[PDB]
Amino acid sequence: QNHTLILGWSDKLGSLLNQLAIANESLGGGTIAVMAERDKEDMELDIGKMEFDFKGTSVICRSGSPLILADLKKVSVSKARTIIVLAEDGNADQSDARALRTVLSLTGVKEGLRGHIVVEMSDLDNEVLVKLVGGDLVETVVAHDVIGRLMIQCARQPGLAQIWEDILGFENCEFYIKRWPQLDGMLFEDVLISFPAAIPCGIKVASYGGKIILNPDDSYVLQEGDEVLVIAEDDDTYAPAPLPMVRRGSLPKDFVYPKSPERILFCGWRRDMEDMITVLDASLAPDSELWMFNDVPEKEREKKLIDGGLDISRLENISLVNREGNAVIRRHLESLPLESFDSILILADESVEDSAIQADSRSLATLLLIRDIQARRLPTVIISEILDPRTKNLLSMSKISDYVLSNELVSMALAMVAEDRQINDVLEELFAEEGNEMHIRQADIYLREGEEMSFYEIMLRARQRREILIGYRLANAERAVINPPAKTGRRKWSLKDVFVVITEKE
Amino acid sequence: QNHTLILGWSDKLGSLLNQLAIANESLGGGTIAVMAERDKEDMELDIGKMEFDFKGTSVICRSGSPLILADLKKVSVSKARTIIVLAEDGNADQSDARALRTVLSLTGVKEGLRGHIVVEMSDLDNEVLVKLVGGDLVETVVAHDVIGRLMIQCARQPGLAQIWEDILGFENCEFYIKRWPQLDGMLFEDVLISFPAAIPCGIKVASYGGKIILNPDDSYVLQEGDEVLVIAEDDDTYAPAPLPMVRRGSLPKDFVYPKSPERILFCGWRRDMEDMITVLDASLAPDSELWMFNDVPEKEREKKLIDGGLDISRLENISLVNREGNAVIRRHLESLPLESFDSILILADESVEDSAIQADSRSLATLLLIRDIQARRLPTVIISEILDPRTKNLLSMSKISDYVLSNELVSMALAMVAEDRQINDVLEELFAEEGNEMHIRQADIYLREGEEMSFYEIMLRARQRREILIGYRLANAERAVINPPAKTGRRKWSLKDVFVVITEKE
Amino acid sequence: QNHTLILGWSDKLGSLLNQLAIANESLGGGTIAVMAERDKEDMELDIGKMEFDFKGTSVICRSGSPLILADLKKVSVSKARTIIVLAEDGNADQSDARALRTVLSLTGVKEGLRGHIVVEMSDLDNEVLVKLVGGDLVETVVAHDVIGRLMIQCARQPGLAQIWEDILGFENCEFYIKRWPQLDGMLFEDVLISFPAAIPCGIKVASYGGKIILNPDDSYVLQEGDEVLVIAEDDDTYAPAPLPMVRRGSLPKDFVYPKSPERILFCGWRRDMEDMITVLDASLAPDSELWMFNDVPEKEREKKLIDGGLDISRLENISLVNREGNAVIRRHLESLPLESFDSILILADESVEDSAIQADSRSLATLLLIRDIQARRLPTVIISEILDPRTKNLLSMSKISDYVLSNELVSMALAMVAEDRQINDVLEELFAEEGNEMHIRQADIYLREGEEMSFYEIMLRARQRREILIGYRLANAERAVINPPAKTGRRKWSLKDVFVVITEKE
Amino acid sequence: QNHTLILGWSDKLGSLLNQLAIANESLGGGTIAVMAERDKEDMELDIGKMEFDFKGTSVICRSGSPLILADLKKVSVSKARTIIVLAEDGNADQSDARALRTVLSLTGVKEGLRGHIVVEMSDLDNEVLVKLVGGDLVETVVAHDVIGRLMIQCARQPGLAQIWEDILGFENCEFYIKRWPQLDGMLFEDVLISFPAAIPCGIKVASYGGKIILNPDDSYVLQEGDEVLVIAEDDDTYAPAPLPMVRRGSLPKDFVYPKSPERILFCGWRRDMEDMITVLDASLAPDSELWMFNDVPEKEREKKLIDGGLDISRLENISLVNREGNAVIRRHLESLPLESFDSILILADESVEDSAIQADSRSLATLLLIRDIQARRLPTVIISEILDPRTKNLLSMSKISDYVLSNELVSMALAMVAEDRQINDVLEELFAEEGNEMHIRQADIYLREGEEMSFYEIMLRARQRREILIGYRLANAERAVINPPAKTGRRKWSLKDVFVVITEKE
Ligand SMILES: [Ca+2]
Ligand SMILES: [Ca+2]
Ligand SMILES: [Ca+2]
Ligand SMILES: [Ca+2]
Ligand SMILES: [Ca+2]
Ligand SMILES: [Ca+2]
Ligand SMILES: [Ca+2]
Ligand SMILES: [Ca+2]
Ligand SMILES: [Ca+2]
Ligand SMILES: [Ca+2]
Ligand SMILES: [Ca+2]
Ligand SMILES: [Ca+2]
Ligand SMILES: [K+]
Ligand SMILES: [K+]
Ligand SMILES: [K+]
Ligand SMILES: [K+]
Ligand SMILES: [Mg+2]
Ligand SMILES: [Mg+2]
Ligand SMILES: [Mg+2]
Ligand SMILES: [Mg+2]
Ligand code: NA
Ligand code: NA
Ligand code: NA
Ligand code: NA
Structure with a gap:
C-alpha cells in the first residue's frame, strides 16, 4: 500500500500534509493515513476545512491509539512506506514520553514494517533513549533543537532565512539522492557540471556503507553503487547530459578576511538554552559577546547552565553578559544597548512554551517594544521564534512576517525525512x-x-x-x-x- | 447582505444583541449572524431564552472558527456591514491573543470586507499591535480602559452615571452623524438651533479628511461635504427647520471658582491601575489625595507603577497614600477614614478578575462592609465595578444598583462603534x-x-x-x-x- | 400547583428528597420539581436509583438555569409552596455567589411567588447580603454554622446527638405550629397538658406580630390569633382533649450545682473557626480550656482570629492552648494529653473542605489514630464532622458511626424550614x-x-x-x-x- | 453464578483479566463482570481490543457505581465468588478513600455475599481502617508496599526477579491449597515426596483454625481436616502417588558463612520510603550502608522519616548516607560512587507518582544516565520501578526489560488472592x-x-x-x-x- 502513515494530531499537521501533497504531486497524488485519539468525524471535518490544494493526494482518518495493535492494523501500519510520529502540542517531556511508547509499540509489530519511522522529538535529552530502542528503524528530528540552530544561522547571515525557507520542504528546489549508472567512472568535478536542471552537492558512497559525503573532493571517482545527492526542483525533473565546455579561470580575491566579533542578544530563557550557547560559541569570531536578557536571577543562571552540560569557563569565542528583567516591560528593555546588537533573537521562554498562543503573544510584544524603543530615541536584525505555524501564516502579509521563524520549518523537515530518510543526515550536517x-x-x-x-x-x-x-x-x-x-x-x-x-x- | 457579524461568545453577547436590535428597530429589523466555537444547537437554545424583544431583527447562529476561511464564508464575512470581535471571558492576555489572530484572519479574506471590524480589547498594552496589523479596517474598544475612565468621571460628578447610561447604547438619545446639504454656508451657531429634535455637538470637517471636531467655534461656516454630529433619539427622527428667533442675553455669574481638592479611595489593585492614576492626576484639583487600599505590600507598589509607565515623582495634582489590607475584612477597612472620602471606587482586583463571579462577589462584599462600618460608628459616593452584565441586571430592583457600573456599558459602546465607526473618536474624546x-x-x-x-x-x-x-x-x-x-x-x-x-x- | 421546587443538585439532594417524602406521606404524597444545569436524562437516572421509599411523592426533573426566566417557568416557579436553593458542593464562596444571584433572579419574577425561598448558605459572612436582597421572601440556613453549633452541643452533652437526630427532619417527632381556637383563654400551663399526642413548647403570639415565644410563662393566656408550637409525630396526629387531673408536688432537689470546667480539643482549623470559639466561650463554665491542634503556625493564629472578629483578650470562660501539627500523623497526636479531654471535635480543615471525600478521609484517619494511641498506652467523647451524607449512611452499621455528625442534618433542617418557615426561628433559638x-x-x-x-x-x-x-x-x-x-x-x-x-x- | 466481579477500571485491568483467564482455562473458561463509571460501549470497545487469548472466559461490562445498590445488582454482586476492588490510577489517598466507601457499600448488601472481597490498596497507612470495616469479608493487597518488598528481595538476590515473575500469577507454576484425605496420618516428610507433579510447601492446620504453616517440621503428622499447600502447574494437574524410595545422605558443606555487608543506593524519595528502609534494615548484614539520592534537603529528611514511624537511631544493620540532587541530571549522578553499589533501586518519586507516564519517563532516564556515566569513565544490578504495566510490556523485547519491575506483579497478586484468599497469607509471609x-x-x-x-x-x-x-x-x-x-x-x-x-x- 506504500502510503504515508501519520500517528497523532497537532498544530503542525496541516502544514505537514501540505508538504507531503507537494512531494506526491509528481506521482499524480498518493495516500496519507492519519490516526489520532480523536473522533473520526471531527478529524474529517477539520481536514475538509484545510485550505491547501491536496494535488491528488487522498487523506484517510481513523480513530485509534498507536499503542494498540488492533488500531495500527486499521491503518495498514506494516505496509506504509513511512510512519511519522507527531509530537503532541504542550509539554515537551510528556510528548517525548508518548513518542517513546509509540516507537516501542511500532517495533513490536510482528509482521514488521516496510518503511522507516520519523519521530518528532521535543527535547534533545530524550533523544538517546528513543534512538536506543528504535534501532535501525527510527530517524529522530528534534524540533526544538533544529529551530534553535536555524535561528542562529539566520542571525549570523540574515539572507539565509529566505534560502532555508526555499530549500526546506517541497515547494521550489530541495535535496534528492539517486543512482546514475551512466556516471560511474566520472570525476566528481565533471558530475558537478553534468545536470542542466540540478546541482550535485555530494555522493552516497557505497564503499562507506552508504554514507553521504557532502562537498566531496573534485578528484573522487564515482564507483559502482554510488548515488548522487543534488538540489533539484522535484525527484523527476533532472538527469545528466553530455558535458558542457566551461571556460576555466582564477579567483580575483581568494582571501580570508579576519572575521569580525559579533554582539548577539538572546531575549528569554529558552528551554535547553545551553544547547544554543554551545552552537553560538563554535560559530562566532573571538571576542564576541552573548547578552542574555530574561527573568532568571543571575545567581541561578550558572547552575542551570552547568546542569545542562555547559562549562562557561571553557567558552572559546564568546563572553556572556547577563541582564535580568521582563522582556515585555518597556522600561526593562530600554536599559539594554539595543542599537549595538548585530542581531537579536526573541526566544520562546521555558516558563510559557507549553502554551503556543501565550508564548507567541509575548514574543510579538517584545518585538514591537524593541522596535519602538529604538525608534523613539533616534533623533537591526531581529528573529522571533513562533511556535504555532498558523500564527506564522496569519502574519504573512504583515511587515512583521520578516521578523519570524516558525515550526512550519519542522513540518518541512519532517516531510523531507519522511520522503528519504538519508536527508536527515544531510540536514544534520548543514545545521551542525x-x-x-x-x-x-x-x-x-x-x-x-x-x-x-x-x-x-x-x-x-x-x-x-x-x-x-x-x-x-x-x-x-x-x-x-x-x-x-x-x-x-x-x-x-x-x-x-x-x-x-x-x-x-x- | 449588510448584516452585523459577531465573532465569538461571551457574557456580554446578550446585551450587545439587545443594543443592535434597538438600533435596527427603525429599519423594521435587520440580521445578526453569530459564529462561535460552540455547538449550533446550544447557541440557538441560549438565544431562544434571551428575554429582550428582538424588534424584528433576526439572529442566525453558526458553529465555526474565525481563523478558518471555510467558516467565515458560512456567515458571509465579506458582505457584512460590520464585524464585531467579542472578547473571551477570562484572562485578558488570552483574549487579546485571540483578537489579534482573528484580525489577521479577517484582513486575509481575499474577497475583502465591505464594512469595518470592531475589536473588543481587554488590555491597553495589547492595542497597538492589533491596530498596527488591522490598519484602516479596525476600530479598537479597550473595554477595561473605558470602564476605568467612566468610573473616574462618575466619581468626580455623580449625576453623570445616569447621563452616561442614557447616552450610551441605543435606548433614549445618542450620537448620529449625517450630511445636510441644505445647511452648507450656515454658521455653526445657527446650525446649533436648527433642529427641533436634536442637538448639534460637532462637525465632521471635510477639509480635515473627515475629522470630527467636537464643540467647534460658533463662527465656523459649514462647507460642502461637512456633516453634522448631533444627539438625537434615532437616526431618522430629526431634521433641520427654519431658524427660530431666540432672545439673546448675558450670563449673570460667568465666573470660574477655584476647584476644591478631592480625596478619593481606590479599593483593590486593578490590572493596569497606573492608567487610572494618570487619568485621575490630570482630572483633579491640586493638593488632592488618592488613597489606595489593597493587599499589595507597599514596598512593591512603586515597582508595579513604574513598570506600567507611571512616574510617581511627576504627579502634578495628587499625592498618593498607601494602605495595605484585605478589602473584604471588616477590621482592615475600619482603619480607613471612610467618612472623609469624596468618593470611593471598589475595583475588580487583578488577582480575581479572571473569574467575574468571584470578582463581583468581592466587590459587593466590600460595598456592604463600607456602608455598615460607617453606619455603626455614626452616633457617600461609592462606585463598584461589576464585570458580568447579568449581575448588574439582577441587581436592578435593589437599592445596591445605585452603587454599580457594569460591562453592559462596553456592549453599548461596541454597538455604537459598530453602527458608525466614527463614534469611536467621539467617545474617545469625551472619555479623555x-x-x-x-x-x-x-x-x-x-x-x-x-x-x-x-x-x-x-x-x-x-x-x-x-x-x-x-x-x-x-x-x-x-x-x-x-x-x-x-x-x-x-x-x-x-x-x-x-x-x-x-x-x-x- | 403548591409543589416543592428545588434549584440545583448536590450530595445532599437525595436525603433532602427523602425528608420531603416523609413530610408529604400524611397527604398521600406530593410533588417535587428539581431543576439543575445537568442533562434531564442523567437526573432521571440518578433519581431512579435512589433507595428510599418515595411514599407517593412524585419527583420531576428539568434541565435549566435558575437565572433564566424561561427555565423558571418550566417548573412553575410562581406556584410552588416553597423554593429551596441548594448549595453547590465545593468552595463555599462560589456556592454563596450563586445563591445570591439565584435569590435576585427569584425576586425578579414578575408574577411573584406564592411561597418562601429557603437558601442553603455555606459561609456566615455571606448571609447578610442575601438576606438584604431577599427581604421577606428568604429564610437562610447557614449549613456550616449550624453543623458547628450542633457539634458543640453534642460535645457538651453527648446523649444530645441521638436526640437532635430524632427531632430534626421528619422521621419520629418534630415541631409543628397550628391554630387551636378552642384553646383561646386557656393558661399556657393547661395547654401544656392538653394534648395526649403532643408536647407544647411555645406560642406564636399574635400581638407580637407572629413572633414565636419558646417556653412562655405558665400564666400566659392564649389570645385570639395565637398558635401553639408542639413536638408531635406528624402534622395531623395530635389534637387537644379535656384536661387530665395531674397530681401536683414539689421538686426534691431543686438545686443548681457549680458547673465544672471542661477541657475540649478542636483538631483541624475549620473555616470560620472563630465562630465556634465564640459559641464555646459562651457555653462553658469558667476556667475551661480550649486546645486547638492544627497545622497553622501559632504566630499566625491570632491574626486569623482577630480578622474574623474574635477578641481573644475578652474571652470570659475559656483559655486557649495552641499546639501545631498534622492531625493525621501519629507522632504529633501522641504528644497531646488525649486522655484528659472531656470531648474532642475532629473538624473538616479549611485547607481540604472543598473536597468532601478528602476531608472525610482525613477526619476518619484522625479518629482511628486517636483511639489507637490511647489504647496502646493504656496499661472518651469524640465527634467527627462528615461532609458527604453518603459517607455517613455508609458508616451506619459500623461502630465508627457513633463518632460522626454529618450534613444529613442540613438536609433535615432545610426540609423543616421548607415545610414551615417559622421553624427556622425555633431552631435558631435552640442552637443559639x-x-x-x-x-x-x-x-x-x-x-x-x-x-x-x-x-x-x-x-x-x-x-x-x-x-x-x-x-x-x-x-x-x-x-x-x-x-x-x-x-x-x-x-x-x-x-x-x-x-x-x-x-x-x- | 460464581463469576469474578471487578469494580473499577485502571491501567492494571487488562493484565488482571489475562491472569483470571489463565486461572479459568482448566475449567474451560469462566465469567468476569466489570463494572465501572464509564460508558458501557467504550468499555466494550476497549476490552475488544485487548490482545490476549481469553481462553474461553467471557467478559461482561456494565456501567455503574459500586456505591449504588441498583448498580451492584446489575452485576449479581451477591452471587460472585470473588469481588475485586481495583485502585484508581493517580493519587493514592483518593484511590484509598474510594476503596473504603466501596467496602462499606459491599458490606451493606443485605442479601450478603457468597465470596470474599480483594481490595487493592495504594497506601499502607490506609489499610487498617479498610480492614476494620471489612471484617472477615476483606483481603487487602497493598500494591505500593508489595512492590517495594519485591524490589528489595530482587536487589538482594537478582536471580529472584525471574523466579518471582514465574511463581506469581497463573502462567507456569503457583500455589494451590487442597484437602487430600488419603494423606491423613502421613508425616510431612513423606508428604513432601508424594506428588510427582507438585512440591508441598506447607500445611493448612485444622487444629489452628485453618492457619497456614509454611515449611512445617518433617515430623508433623497430617490430621483430619488439614490441607496441603503445594506449588503446581494448575489446580488439577497434581495428585499423590505411592512413596518413591529416595536415597538418603549427608550435606557436604552444611555451613553458614558470615553474610557480607552490602551497599545499596535508593534513587528518588518514594512515598512511604521509611517502610522500605525498615524492611532493608532487617534484611542486610551488619555494617551495611543505604545511600539515598533525591531532591529532598538533608535537613528535612529526618522529619519525614520520624513522622512515618522510623527511628533512625535504632537501625541495627544499616547506616544512612544522604545525598541531594536531581536523578535525571547527569552531573549530579556522576558525583555518586556508582561502581561501588551492590545494587541500585530507581524508585518512582513521590513528587511525580500520581502520573505513571511522568514517573516512568524519569525512572528510564535515570537508568540510561547511570549506565552511561559508568561506561564513559571505564578505561551492576539495577532495578527500576515501572508504574504502568503497558510500559513494561512495551519494553519486553528491549534489553532495558532486564532492569524493570512493574505493577503487572500487582495484577498477578490480585488474581492469586482472588482465586484463593489464603494465598494472601502465603505471599505476606514470603514478602515479610x-x-x-x-x-x-x-x-x-x-x-x-x-x-x-x-x-x-x-x-x-x-x-x-x-x-x-x-x-x-x-x-x-x-x-x-x-x-x-x-x-x-x-x-x-x-x-x-x-x-x-x-x-x-x-
Ligand atoms: Ca515528487
Ligand atoms: Ca532538556
Ligand atoms: Ca520541489
Ligand atoms: Ca435606528
Ligand atoms: Ca496591561
Ligand atoms: Ca435611541
Ligand atoms: Ca406530614
Ligand atoms: Ca467566612
Ligand atoms: Ca414525623
Ligand atoms: Ca485453573
Ligand atoms: Ca502513607
Ligand atoms: Ca499455572
Ligand atoms: K524546497
Ligand atoms: K442612548
Ligand atoms: K423528627
Ligand atoms: K505462576
Ligand atoms: Mg542537554
Ligand atoms: Mg500600559
Ligand atoms: Mg465572620
Ligand atoms: Mg506508615
Ligand atoms: Na555544518
Ligand atoms: Na475629554
Ligand atoms: Na439557645
Ligand atoms: Na519472610
Missing part, C-alpha cells in the same frame, strides 16, 4: 557547527565588476576554494535563486551581487 | 482628559431665580462660555433630560436646577 | 447561646428512687424550675423517648433515668 | 522479613562436583538444614526451573548449578 554549511559570499571573491560569465563558470571558480556554488542573489533582487536555469548562459555580474555556497569553515 | 468632556453645572451661572426662558435661550447663553448645552436636571427630578422636547417653549427655572454641557476644561 | 436550649437532666432533681408517677406529673414538677419536659431516657435504654405515649400512665422511676428538657441557662 | 522466604543457594552446600542424583535426593538433603527445595537453575541456563518434572530421575550436577529454596533466616 562541524563540516559543511551554507554561506552567502560577496561577488568580488569570484569575479571583477562587469565580468561576463555563466553560472557554471563561477561554479568552477568556487571549487578552487572548495565551495559548491548552489545559487545567487542579484544586487536588487528580493529573493535568491537556488539551482538557476540555463547554467551555461552568460551575463554581466555586479560586485553587489552575492553567491550562495556550501562550504566548510575557516 | 484632553479636549471636551461632560459637566453638570449649577443654574446660577446661566440664569437668575425664576427667570422665564426656553432651552434654546439658555443654550445661547452657554455658548458665551463655549459650552454646548445638551440637557438639564430639574430640582426634584430623579433623571436628567437629554435633548429635551420643545426647545423653544419657555418655563421658570430654579437655582436648584442643573444643566448638562459639553465643554473644554479650565 | 442565648435563650432556651435542650438539656439532659439527672432524675434526682425531679423525683425520689422508685417514686411512682406519670410523665405529666414530672412535667409539672419541671415547670417549677421553668423547664418544658419533652422526654426521657430510661436507665438501660439505648434511645431517649421524645413525646412519650400515654402521658397519664404511672410507672416507678429510677435515679439512673434521665430527663430531656427545654430550658434557659443559669 | 520474618518467617520463611526464598533463597538461591550454591550447589556445594548440597552436593559434590559431578555427583549423580535426583531432585528428590537433593530435596531430602535440603531438609537437614530445614529448607524446602522448590527448584534449580543449571550452570548455563537463563531460567530457573520451579517444580521440575521427573523428580526421581538422576543427573550429574555441577558446583555452578544453583538451588531455589524456601527457608527461614539465620
